Amino acid sequence: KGEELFTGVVPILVELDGDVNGHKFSVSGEGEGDATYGKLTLKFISTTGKLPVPWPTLVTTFVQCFSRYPDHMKRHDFFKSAMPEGYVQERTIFFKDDGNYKTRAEVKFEGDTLVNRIELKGIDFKEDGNILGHKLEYNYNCHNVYIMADKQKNGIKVNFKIRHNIEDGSVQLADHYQQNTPIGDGPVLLPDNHYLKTCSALSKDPNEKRDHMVLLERVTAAGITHGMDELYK
């Protein structure tokens, strides 16, 4: 079905307008995905100047439909099943001992292009916190994304904890509460419990002047039966 839509490489467009503790900013991303290898390549650029928050804090915000689901786990892939029409992705991200982001996004095909348009509001951040104070290392760890069906909503409930290395020394945890629901009136794949093993590499474009981020990410569905295909482990 929608599965077919991901047979190969898909171009992606990402749009984000945000406001954190009153700071207004805008980001635009482009790149492509290949669910066959569970691989994404993306570049984002702030259009509103220097980013008021660390790039890393937005990674998760900025298309799980690109995950790699093993053949045997295909009945579990809500994301792809959800579309041509797309899904709405809503989240509440709690930065431990700090503020929080609430986000609402729509992911769907617009032509040949897989698009992710986002609205983000962040509040209660500490002016000299790890976030506003930009105390995060420019890096990213691997994380297990837990997935569950949400029968009642005809979608899924997703939960995970991101671990942000603090330049000072420890880790800044960010707890993610996530919900996905189909935009269309079609039937979707409500899966059995599972998870995606995810890893992201953050870099920069030497020949790029605006504040930006280059993201290389890989996602492999897991939790039901072991695969050698598994990213980590």
Side-chain angles (χ1 to χ4, degrees), residues 2 4-6 8-12 14-16 18-23 25-27 29 31-38 40-42 44-49 51-70 72-73 76-79 81-84 86-89 91-95 97-101 103-107 109 111 114-118 120 122-134 136-150 152 154-156 158 160 162-167 169 171-178 180-184 186-206 208 211-215 217-228 230-233:
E4 152 57 33
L5 268 60
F6 297 86
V9 180
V10 190
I12 314 168
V14 176
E15 265 332 299
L16 187 151
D19 168 343
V20 170
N21 271 35
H23 276 112
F25 54 100
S26 299
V27 179
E32 44 187 37
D34 191 4
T36 132
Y37 320 80
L40 283 135
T41 305
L42 269 332
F44 312 87
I45 309 139
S46 166
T47 67
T48 47
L51 227 62
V53 299
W55 279 107
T57 69
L58 305 171
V59 166
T60 66
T61 296
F62 287 151
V63 293
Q64 297 160 318
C65 47
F66 285 105
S67 315
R68 193 217 219 122
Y69 272 77
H72 71 281
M73 276 190 59
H76 302 293
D77 173 2
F78 166 92
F79 311 97
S81 91
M83 71 182 291
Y87 48 81
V88 171
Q89 180 169 299
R91 284 202 186 109
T92 313
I93 293 166
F94 296 100
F95 285 93
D97 198 21
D98 206 333
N100 58 86
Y101 294 158
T103 57
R104 177 173 166 302
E106 283 192 350
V107 14
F109 275 88
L114 189 284
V115 176
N116 177 33
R117 272 172 231 281
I118 318 140
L120 181 158
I123 67 185
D124 295 347
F125 292 84
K126 304 164 162 187
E127 294 278 336
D128 219 45
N130 281 326
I131 291 95
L132 291 179
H134 289 280
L136 298 179
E137 303 181 347
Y138 188 67
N139 58 36
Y140 217 90
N141 289 310
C142 305
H143 306 94
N144 296 141
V145 174
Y146 307 94
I147 296 170
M148 40 94 338
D150 189 355
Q152 185 165 192
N154 193 46
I156 51 163
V158 186
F160 61 98
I162 280 313
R163 290 146 51 234
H164 292 298
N165 295 169
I166 282 170
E167 204 81 51
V171 173
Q172 163 77 60
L173 306 177
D175 277 294
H176 295 54
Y177 296 94
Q178 162 184 346
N180 290 76
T181 60
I183 277 155
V188 309
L189 265 47
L190 304 205
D192 284 344
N193 290 0
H194 73 281
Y195 70 103
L196 322 164
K197 288 187 173 171
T198 150
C199 298
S200 326
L202 322 187
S203 78
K204 254 107 156 89
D205 171 2
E208 176 64 69
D211 198 5
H212 75 283
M213 175 170 66
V214 173
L215 166 50
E217 180 161 289
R218 228 145 113 47
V219 182
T220 82
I224 286 154
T225 186
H226 179 272
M228 306 275 5
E230 315 206 348
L231 202 51
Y232 54 83
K233 196 238 118 47

mmCIF file of all heavy atoms in Angstrom, residues 121-168, unseen atoms left out:
data_model
loop_
_atom_site.group_PDB
_atom_site.id
_atom_site.type_symbol
_atom_site.label_atom_id
_atom_site.label_comp_id
_atom_site.label_asym_id
_atom_site.label_seq_id
_atom_site.Cartn_x
_atom_site.Cartn_y
_atom_site.Cartn_z
ATOM 1 N N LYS A 121 5.922 25.193 20.501
ATOM 2 C CA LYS A 121 5.878 26.213 21.506
ATOM 3 C C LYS A 121 6.658 25.727 22.698
ATOM 4 O O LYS A 121 6.421 24.645 23.260
ATOM 5 C CB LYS A 121 4.463 26.639 21.886
ATOM 6 N N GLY A 122 7.614 26.522 23.093
ATOM 7 C CA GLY A 122 8.370 26.068 24.225
ATOM 8 C C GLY A 122 8.232 27.029 25.376
ATOM 9 O O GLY A 122 8.277 28.255 25.191
ATOM 10 N N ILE A 123 8.096 26.482 26.577
ATOM 11 C CA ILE A 123 7.993 27.369 27.694
ATOM 12 C C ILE A 123 8.715 26.903 28.917
ATOM 13 O O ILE A 123 9.161 25.758 29.040
ATOM 14 C CB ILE A 123 6.571 27.377 28.152
ATOM 15 C CG1 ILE A 123 6.243 26.017 28.722
ATOM 16 C CG2 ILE A 123 5.617 27.704 27.008
ATOM 17 C CD1 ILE A 123 4.756 25.982 29.072
ATOM 18 N N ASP A 124 8.722 27.853 29.846
ATOM 19 C CA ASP A 124 9.261 27.703 31.171
ATOM 20 C C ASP A 124 10.697 27.317 31.241
ATOM 21 O O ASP A 124 11.128 26.740 32.240
ATOM 22 C CB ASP A 124 8.402 26.732 31.969
ATOM 23 C CG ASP A 124 7.045 27.319 32.168
ATOM 24 O OD1 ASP A 124 6.787 28.498 31.943
ATOM 25 O OD2 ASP A 124 6.189 26.451 32.648
ATOM 26 N N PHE A 125 11.442 27.653 30.196
ATOM 27 C CA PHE A 125 12.872 27.343 30.171
ATOM 28 C C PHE A 125 13.636 28.288 31.039
ATOM 29 O O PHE A 125 13.298 29.477 31.211
ATOM 30 C CB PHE A 125 13.482 27.332 28.749
ATOM 31 C CG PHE A 125 12.909 26.160 27.962
ATOM 32 C CD1 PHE A 125 11.675 26.265 27.308
ATOM 33 C CD2 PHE A 125 13.585 24.940 27.927
ATOM 34 C CE1 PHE A 125 11.112 25.173 26.646
ATOM 35 C CE2 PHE A 125 13.048 23.841 27.255
ATOM 36 C CZ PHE A 125 11.810 23.963 26.623
ATOM 37 N N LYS A 126 14.670 27.746 31.607
ATOM 38 C CA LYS A 126 15.524 28.571 32.408
ATOM 39 C C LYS A 126 16.375 29.400 31.482
ATOM 40 O O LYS A 126 17.086 28.871 30.633
ATOM 41 C CB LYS A 126 16.450 27.785 33.346
ATOM 42 C CG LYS A 126 15.704 26.843 34.287
ATOM 43 C CD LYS A 126 16.610 25.804 34.943
ATOM 44 C CE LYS A 126 15.997 25.149 36.177
ATOM 45 N NZ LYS A 126 16.955 24.267 36.872
ATOM 46 N N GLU A 127 16.344 30.707 31.683
ATOM 47 C CA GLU A 127 17.150 31.592 30.874
ATOM 48 C C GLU A 127 18.619 31.186 30.784
ATOM 49 O O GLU A 127 19.240 31.395 29.740
ATOM 50 C CB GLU A 127 16.896 33.074 31.172
ATOM 51 C CG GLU A 127 15.457 33.452 30.753
ATOM 52 C CD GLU A 127 15.355 33.750 29.272
ATOM 53 O OE1 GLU A 127 16.306 34.105 28.588
ATOM 54 O OE2 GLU A 127 14.129 33.579 28.802
ATOM 55 N N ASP A 128 19.189 30.624 31.867
ATOM 56 C CA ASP A 128 20.558 30.145 31.797
ATOM 57 C C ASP A 128 20.662 28.662 31.957
ATOM 58 O O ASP A 128 21.639 28.175 32.530
ATOM 59 C CB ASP A 128 21.736 30.850 32.467
ATOM 60 C CG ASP A 128 22.940 30.779 31.521
ATOM 61 O OD1 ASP A 128 22.884 31.009 30.308
ATOM 62 O OD2 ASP A 128 24.044 30.417 32.121
ATOM 63 N N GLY A 129 19.632 27.985 31.444
ATOM 64 C CA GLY A 129 19.613 26.542 31.470
ATOM 65 C C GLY A 129 20.495 25.980 30.377
ATOM 66 O O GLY A 129 21.087 26.719 29.576
ATOM 67 N N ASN A 130 20.564 24.648 30.350
ATOM 68 C CA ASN A 130 21.341 23.919 29.362
ATOM 69 C C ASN A 130 20.903 24.212 27.939
ATOM 70 O O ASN A 130 21.684 24.169 26.976
ATOM 71 C CB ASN A 130 21.163 22.428 29.652
ATOM 72 C CG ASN A 130 22.031 21.971 30.804
ATOM 73 O OD1 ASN A 130 23.173 22.461 31.033
ATOM 74 N ND2 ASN A 130 21.496 20.997 31.514
ATOM 75 N N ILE A 131 19.605 24.502 27.841
ATOM 76 C CA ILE A 131 18.937 24.813 26.601
ATOM 77 C C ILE A 131 19.176 26.263 26.146
ATOM 78 O O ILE A 131 19.900 26.487 25.166
ATOM 79 C CB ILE A 131 17.462 24.324 26.632
ATOM 80 C CG1 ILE A 131 17.434 22.772 26.626
ATOM 81 C CG2 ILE A 131 16.698 24.782 25.384
ATOM 82 C CD1 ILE A 131 17.341 22.178 28.020
ATOM 83 N N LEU A 132 18.580 27.235 26.891
ATOM 84 C CA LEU A 132 18.733 28.619 26.560
ATOM 85 C C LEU A 132 20.176 29.015 26.647
ATOM 86 O O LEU A 132 20.655 29.691 25.784
ATOM 87 C CB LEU A 132 17.796 29.541 27.336
ATOM 88 C CG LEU A 132 16.324 29.359 26.911
ATOM 89 C CD1 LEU A 132 15.406 30.282 27.716
ATOM 90 C CD2 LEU A 132 16.148 29.676 25.429
ATOM 91 N N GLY A 133 20.884 28.490 27.654
ATOM 92 C CA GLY A 133 22.288 28.753 27.819
ATOM 93 C C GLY A 133 23.147 28.003 26.814
ATOM 94 O O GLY A 133 24.354 28.113 26.829
ATOM 95 N N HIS A 134 22.552 27.232 25.915
ATOM 96 C CA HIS A 134 23.360 26.510 24.927
ATOM 97 C C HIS A 134 24.470 25.688 25.556
ATOM 98 O O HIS A 134 25.621 25.771 25.135
ATOM 99 C CB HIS A 134 23.955 27.426 23.863
ATOM 100 C CG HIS A 134 22.922 27.944 22.922
ATOM 101 N ND1 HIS A 134 22.454 27.180 21.881
ATOM 102 C CD2 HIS A 134 22.264 29.146 22.893
ATOM 103 C CE1 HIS A 134 21.530 27.926 21.251
ATOM 104 N NE2 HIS A 134 21.387 29.109 21.831
ATOM 105 N N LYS A 135 24.134 24.870 26.549
ATOM 106 C CA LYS A 135 25.173 24.060 27.185
ATOM 107 C C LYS A 135 25.274 22.601 26.656
ATOM 108 O O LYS A 135 25.844 21.734 27.332
ATOM 109 C CB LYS A 135 25.094 24.117 28.725
ATOM 110 C CG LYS A 135 24.557 25.430 29.312
ATOM 111 C CD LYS A 135 24.825 25.552 30.815
ATOM 112 C CE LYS A 135 24.497 26.912 31.436
ATOM 113 N N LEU A 136 24.749 22.322 25.445
ATOM 114 C CA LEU A 136 24.734 20.950 24.935
ATOM 115 C C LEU A 136 25.799 20.567 23.964
ATOM 116 O O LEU A 136 26.129 21.323 23.081
ATOM 117 C CB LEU A 136 23.347 20.574 24.368
ATOM 118 C CG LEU A 136 22.248 20.620 25.444
ATOM 119 C CD1 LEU A 136 20.930 20.266 24.803
ATOM 120 C CD2 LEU A 136 22.538 19.641 26.605
ATOM 121 N N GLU A 137 26.331 19.370 24.101
ATOM 122 C CA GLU A 137 27.346 19.069 23.137
ATOM 123 C C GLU A 137 26.706 18.937 21.800
ATOM 124 O O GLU A 137 25.566 18.527 21.705
ATOM 125 C CB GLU A 137 28.011 17.726 23.398
ATOM 126 C CG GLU A 137 28.642 17.610 24.781
ATOM 127 C CD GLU A 137 29.255 16.256 24.870
ATOM 128 O OE1 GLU A 137 29.008 15.388 24.060
ATOM 129 O OE2 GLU A 137 30.071 16.113 25.880
ATOM 130 N N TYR A 138 27.462 19.203 20.764
ATOM 131 C CA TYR A 138 26.886 19.067 19.441
ATOM 132 C C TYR A 138 27.021 17.632 19.043
ATOM 133 O O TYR A 138 27.881 17.284 18.222
ATOM 134 C CB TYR A 138 27.510 19.989 18.329
ATOM 135 C CG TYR A 138 26.798 20.024 16.952
ATOM 136 C CD1 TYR A 138 25.524 20.581 16.811
ATOM 137 C CD2 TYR A 138 27.389 19.508 15.791
ATOM 138 C CE1 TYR A 138 24.881 20.654 15.571
ATOM 139 C CE2 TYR A 138 26.768 19.563 14.538
ATOM 140 C CZ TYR A 138 25.500 20.142 14.427
ATOM 141 O OH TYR A 138 24.843 20.228 13.213
ATOM 142 N N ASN A 139 26.197 16.797 19.659
ATOM 143 C CA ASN A 139 26.212 15.395 19.278
ATOM 144 C C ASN A 139 24.904 14.750 19.566
ATOM 145 O O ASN A 139 23.998 15.429 20.071
ATOM 146 C CB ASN A 139 27.390 14.559 19.714
ATOM 147 C CG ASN A 139 27.498 14.602 21.199
ATOM 148 O OD1 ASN A 139 26.498 14.639 21.901
ATOM 149 N ND2 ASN A 139 28.718 14.620 21.665
ATOM 150 N N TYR A 140 24.818 13.460 19.263
ATOM 151 C CA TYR A 140 23.538 12.753 19.491
ATOM 152 C C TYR A 140 23.709 11.262 19.766
ATOM 153 O O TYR A 140 24.502 10.559 19.133
ATOM 154 C CB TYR A 140 22.551 12.977 18.306
ATOM 155 C CG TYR A 140 21.108 13.117 18.724
ATOM 156 C CD1 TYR A 140 20.559 14.370 19.019
ATOM 157 C CD2 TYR A 140 20.305 11.980 18.845
ATOM 158 C CE1 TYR A 140 19.230 14.518 19.418
ATOM 159 C CE2 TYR A 140 18.981 12.120 19.260
ATOM 160 C CZ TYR A 140 18.431 13.379 19.531
ATOM 161 O OH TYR A 140 17.099 13.506 19.914
ATOM 162 N N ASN A 141 22.951 10.752 20.707
ATOM 163 C CA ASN A 141 23.078 9.343 21.021
ATOM 164 C C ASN A 141 21.990 8.497 20.320
ATOM 165 O O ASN A 141 21.083 9.036 19.664
ATOM 166 C CB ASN A 141 23.015 9.188 22.572
ATOM 167 C CG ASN A 141 24.253 9.702 23.289
ATOM 168 O OD1 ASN A 141 25.372 9.336 22.916
ATOM 169 N ND2 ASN A 141 24.064 10.541 24.320
ATOM 170 N N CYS A 142 22.083 7.170 20.486
ATOM 171 C CA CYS A 142 21.088 6.240 19.969
ATOM 172 C C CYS A 142 19.960 6.043 20.983
ATOM 173 O O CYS A 142 20.140 6.019 22.186
ATOM 174 C CB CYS A 142 21.656 4.847 19.627
ATOM 175 S SG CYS A 142 23.055 4.853 18.496
ATOM 176 N N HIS A 143 18.752 5.848 20.550
ATOM 177 C CA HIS A 143 17.721 5.678 21.547
ATOM 178 C C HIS A 143 16.669 4.713 21.047
ATOM 179 O O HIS A 143 16.373 4.662 19.843
ATOM 180 C CB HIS A 143 16.996 7.015 21.846
ATOM 181 C CG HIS A 143 17.910 8.174 22.239
ATOM 182 N ND1 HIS A 143 18.386 9.098 21.312
ATOM 183 C CD2 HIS A 143 18.393 8.544 23.468
ATOM 184 C CE1 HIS A 143 19.169 9.950 21.984
ATOM 185 N NE2 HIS A 143 19.203 9.638 23.280
ATOM 186 N N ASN A 144 16.069 3.999 22.000
ATOM 187 C CA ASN A 144 14.958 3.103 21.719
ATOM 188 C C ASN A 144 13.635 3.842 21.787
ATOM 189 O O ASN A 144 13.282 4.421 22.823
ATOM 190 C CB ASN A 144 14.888 2.003 22.732
ATOM 191 C CG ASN A 144 16.138 1.265 22.535
ATOM 192 O OD1 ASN A 144 16.740 0.836 23.506
ATOM 193 N ND2 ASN A 144 16.562 1.241 21.272
ATOM 194 N N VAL A 145 12.899 3.814 20.679
ATOM 195 C CA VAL A 145 11.629 4.483 20.654
ATOM 196 C C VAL A 145 10.485 3.464 20.871
ATOM 197 O O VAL A 145 10.221 2.637 19.978
ATOM 198 C CB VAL A 145 11.536 5.151 19.296
ATOM 199 C CG1 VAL A 145 10.143 5.744 19.173
ATOM 200 C CG2 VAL A 145 12.605 6.249 19.184
ATOM 201 N N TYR A 146 9.817 3.483 22.050
ATOM 202 C CA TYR A 146 8.748 2.517 22.298
ATOM 203 C C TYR A 146 7.419 2.848 21.631
ATOM 204 O O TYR A 146 6.925 3.970 21.702
ATOM 205 C CB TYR A 146 8.566 2.215 23.767
ATOM 206 C CG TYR A 146 9.889 1.810 24.328
ATOM 207 C CD1 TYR A 146 10.722 2.749 24.946
ATOM 208 C CD2 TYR A 146 10.320 0.490 24.210
ATOM 209 C CE1 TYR A 146 11.975 2.381 25.444
ATOM 210 C CE2 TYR A 146 11.585 0.123 24.669
ATOM 211 C CZ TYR A 146 12.410 1.060 25.296
ATOM 212 O OH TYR A 146 13.644 0.652 25.768
ATOM 213 N N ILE A 147 6.837 1.855 20.970
ATOM 214 C CA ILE A 147 5.583 2.069 20.261
ATOM 215 C C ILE A 147 4.455 1.162 20.670
ATOM 216 O O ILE A 147 4.593 -0.032 20.815
ATOM 217 C CB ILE A 147 5.796 1.833 18.784
ATOM 218 C CG1 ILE A 147 6.768 2.883 18.260
ATOM 219 C CG2 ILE A 147 4.454 1.837 18.042
ATOM 220 C CD1 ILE A 147 7.232 2.585 16.838
ATOM 221 N N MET A 148 3.334 1.799 20.826
ATOM 222 C CA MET A 148 2.123 1.108 21.133
ATOM 223 C C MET A 148 0.895 1.589 20.393
ATOM 224 O O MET A 148 0.803 2.738 19.968
ATOM 225 C CB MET A 148 1.972 0.219 22.367
ATOM 226 C CG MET A 148 2.626 0.732 23.640
ATOM 227 S SD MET A 148 1.471 1.681 24.666
ATOM 228 C CE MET A 148 0.293 2.135 23.371
ATOM 229 N N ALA A 149 -0.032 0.683 20.168
ATOM 230 C CA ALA A 149 -1.235 1.055 19.482
ATOM 231 C C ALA A 149 -2.088 1.785 20.460
ATOM 232 O O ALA A 149 -2.049 1.548 21.665
ATOM 233 C CB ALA A 149 -1.988 -0.172 19.020
ATOM 234 N N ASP A 150 -2.836 2.691 19.921
ATOM 235 C CA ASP A 150 -3.776 3.459 20.668
ATOM 236 C C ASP A 150 -5.098 3.187 19.991
ATOM 237 O O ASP A 150 -5.520 3.880 19.069
ATOM 238 C CB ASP A 150 -3.431 4.948 20.588
ATOM 239 C CG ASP A 150 -4.310 5.670 21.551
ATOM 240 O OD1 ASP A 150 -5.195 5.078 22.169
ATOM 241 O OD2 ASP A 150 -4.043 6.956 21.635
ATOM 242 N N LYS A 151 -5.719 2.098 20.384
ATOM 243 C CA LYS A 151 -6.949 1.688 19.714
ATOM 244 C C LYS A 151 -7.992 2.725 19.657
ATOM 245 O O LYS A 151 -8.573 3.009 18.604
ATOM 246 C CB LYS A 151 -7.492 0.324 20.124
ATOM 247 C CG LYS A 151 -6.577 -0.800 19.602
ATOM 248 C CD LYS A 151 -6.777 -2.135 20.322
ATOM 249 C CE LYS A 151 -5.958 -3.317 19.781
ATOM 250 N N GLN A 152 -8.183 3.269 20.830
ATOM 251 C CA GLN A 152 -9.166 4.265 21.042
ATOM 252 C C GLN A 152 -9.057 5.461 20.112
ATOM 253 O O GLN A 152 -10.092 6.057 19.759
ATOM 254 C CB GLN A 152 -9.155 4.671 22.517
ATOM 255 C CG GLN A 152 -10.290 5.678 22.829
ATOM 256 C CD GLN A 152 -10.614 5.895 24.307
ATOM 257 O OE1 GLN A 152 -11.647 6.502 24.590
ATOM 258 N NE2 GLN A 152 -9.734 5.484 25.243
ATOM 259 N N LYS A 153 -7.811 5.832 19.741
ATOM 260 C CA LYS A 153 -7.526 6.992 18.868
ATOM 261 C C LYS A 153 -7.272 6.527 17.445
ATOM 262 O O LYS A 153 -7.039 7.301 16.539
ATOM 263 N N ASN A 154 -7.307 5.219 17.233
ATOM 264 C CA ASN A 154 -7.017 4.767 15.899
ATOM 265 C C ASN A 154 -5.617 5.254 15.447
ATOM 266 O O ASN A 154 -5.422 5.711 14.314
ATOM 267 C CB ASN A 154 -8.078 5.258 14.900
ATOM 268 C CG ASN A 154 -7.959 4.528 13.561
ATOM 269 O OD1 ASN A 154 -7.826 3.284 13.544
ATOM 270 N ND2 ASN A 154 -7.984 5.283 12.434
ATOM 271 N N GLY A 155 -4.635 5.149 16.346
ATOM 272 C CA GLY A 155 -3.281 5.582 16.060
ATOM 273 C C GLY A 155 -2.335 4.906 17.051
ATOM 274 O O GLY A 155 -2.642 3.825 17.563
ATOM 275 N N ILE A 156 -1.183 5.541 17.309
ATOM 276 C CA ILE A 156 -0.191 4.990 18.228
ATOM 277 C C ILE A 156 0.236 5.991 19.307
ATOM 278 O O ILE A 156 0.049 7.197 19.169
ATOM 279 C CB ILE A 156 1.010 4.519 17.447
ATOM 280 C CG1 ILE A 156 1.473 5.654 16.533
ATOM 281 C CG2 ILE A 156 0.580 3.296 16.622
ATOM 282 C CD1 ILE A 156 2.912 5.423 16.035
ATOM 283 N N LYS A 157 0.767 5.442 20.396
ATOM 284 C CA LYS A 157 1.293 6.198 21.494
ATOM 285 C C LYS A 157 2.749 5.784 21.507
ATOM 286 O O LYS A 157 3.071 4.570 21.453
ATOM 287 C CB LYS A 157 0.559 6.069 22.826
ATOM 288 N N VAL A 158 3.625 6.812 21.455
ATOM 289 C CA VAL A 158 5.076 6.644 21.402
ATOM 290 C C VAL A 158 5.742 7.340 22.587
ATOM 291 O O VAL A 158 5.310 8.431 22.964
ATOM 292 C CB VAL A 158 5.624 7.134 20.061
ATOM 293 C CG1 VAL A 158 7.119 6.838 19.930
ATOM 294 C CG2 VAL A 158 4.854 6.487 18.896
ATOM 295 N N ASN A 159 6.743 6.665 23.217
ATOM 296 C CA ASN A 159 7.438 7.178 24.404
ATOM 297 C C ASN A 159 8.884 6.829 24.357
ATOM 298 O O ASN A 159 9.257 5.709 23.992
ATOM 299 C CB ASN A 159 6.886 6.663 25.797
ATOM 300 N N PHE A 160 9.686 7.802 24.761
ATOM 301 C CA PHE A 160 11.123 7.631 24.863
ATOM 302 C C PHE A 160 11.786 8.774 25.621
ATOM 303 O O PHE A 160 11.185 9.832 25.888
ATOM 304 C CB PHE A 160 11.802 7.274 23.546
ATOM 305 C CG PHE A 160 11.586 8.380 22.556
ATOM 306 C CD1 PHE A 160 12.577 9.342 22.339
ATOM 307 C CD2 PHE A 160 10.399 8.471 21.824
ATOM 308 C CE1 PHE A 160 12.419 10.384 21.419
ATOM 309 C CE2 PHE A 160 10.218 9.504 20.895
ATOM 310 C CZ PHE A 160 11.223 10.460 20.695
ATOM 311 N N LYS A 161 13.030 8.528 25.978
ATOM 312 C CA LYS A 161 13.815 9.473 26.721
ATOM 313 C C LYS A 161 15.062 9.797 25.926
ATOM 314 O O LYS A 161 15.908 8.924 25.679
ATOM 315 C CB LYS A 161 14.180 8.791 28.046
ATOM 316 C CG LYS A 161 14.793 9.644 29.153
ATOM 317 C CD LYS A 161 15.023 8.854 30.457
ATOM 318 C CE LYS A 161 13.803 8.985 31.390
ATOM 319 N N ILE A 162 15.209 11.060 25.507
ATOM 320 C CA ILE A 162 16.438 11.399 24.783
ATOM 321 C C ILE A 162 17.537 11.791 25.781
ATOM 322 O O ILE A 162 17.282 12.443 26.790
ATOM 323 C CB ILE A 162 16.180 12.526 23.812
ATOM 324 C CG1 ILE A 162 15.508 12.033 22.515
ATOM 325 C CG2 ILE A 162 17.505 13.164 23.496
ATOM 326 C CD1 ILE A 162 16.141 10.773 21.868
ATOM 327 N N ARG A 163 18.764 11.401 25.514
ATOM 328 C CA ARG A 163 19.886 11.707 26.389
ATOM 329 C C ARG A 163 20.825 12.712 25.742
ATOM 330 O O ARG A 163 21.601 12.376 24.846
ATOM 331 C CB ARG A 163 20.676 10.425 26.662
ATOM 332 C CG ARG A 163 19.899 9.448 27.559
ATOM 333 C CD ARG A 163 20.188 7.973 27.186
ATOM 334 N NE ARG A 163 21.591 7.748 27.125
ATOM 335 C CZ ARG A 163 22.310 7.240 26.149
ATOM 336 N NH1 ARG A 163 21.828 6.753 25.014
ATOM 337 N NH2 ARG A 163 23.604 7.208 26.376
ATOM 338 N N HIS A 164 20.765 13.939 26.224
ATOM 339 C CA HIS A 164 21.598 15.013 25.680
ATOM 340 C C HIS A 164 22.826 15.239 26.512
ATOM 341 O O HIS A 164 22.778 15.719 27.654
ATOM 342 C CB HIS A 164 20.813 16.341 25.644
ATOM 343 C CG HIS A 164 19.652 16.385 24.656
ATOM 344 N ND1 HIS A 164 19.842 16.249 23.276
ATOM 345 C CD2 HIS A 164 18.311 16.569 24.865
ATOM 346 C CE1 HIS A 164 18.652 16.363 22.690
ATOM 347 N NE2 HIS A 164 17.728 16.563 23.606
ATOM 348 N N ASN A 165 23.963 14.923 25.935
ATOM 349 C CA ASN A 165 25.201 15.163 26.634
ATOM 350 C C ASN A 165 25.360 16.660 26.913
ATOM 351 O O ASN A 165 25.091 17.553 26.061
ATOM 352 C CB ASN A 165 26.406 14.626 25.859
ATOM 353 C CG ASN A 165 26.390 13.103 25.719
ATOM 354 O OD1 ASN A 165 27.178 12.544 24.945
ATOM 355 N ND2 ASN A 165 25.493 12.409 26.432
ATOM 356 N N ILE A 166 25.735 16.955 28.151
ATOM 357 C CA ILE A 166 25.903 18.335 28.500
ATOM 358 C C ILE A 166 27.353 18.668 28.335
ATOM 359 O O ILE A 166 28.177 17.864 28.750
ATOM 360 C CB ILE A 166 25.520 18.463 29.935
ATOM 361 C CG1 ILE A 166 24.021 18.473 30.005
ATOM 362 C CG2 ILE A 166 26.014 19.806 30.453
ATOM 363 C CD1 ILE A 166 23.600 18.348 31.461
ATOM 364 N N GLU A 167 27.685 19.784 27.684
ATOM 365 C CA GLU A 167 29.118 20.128 27.505
ATOM 366 C C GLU A 167 29.863 20.159 28.876
ATOM 367 O O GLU A 167 31.009 19.677 29.067
ATOM 368 C CB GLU A 167 29.316 21.414 26.660
ATOM 369 C CG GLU A 167 30.699 21.482 25.958
ATOM 370 C CD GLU A 167 30.868 20.695 24.663
ATOM 371 O OE1 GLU A 167 30.083 20.785 23.717
ATOM 372 O OE2 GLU A 167 31.985 19.967 24.644
ATOM 373 N N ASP A 168 29.183 20.722 29.868
ATOM 374 C CA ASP A 168 29.737 20.726 31.215
ATOM 375 C C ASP A 168 30.134 19.286 31.580
ATOM 376 O O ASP A 168 31.310 18.968 31.615
#
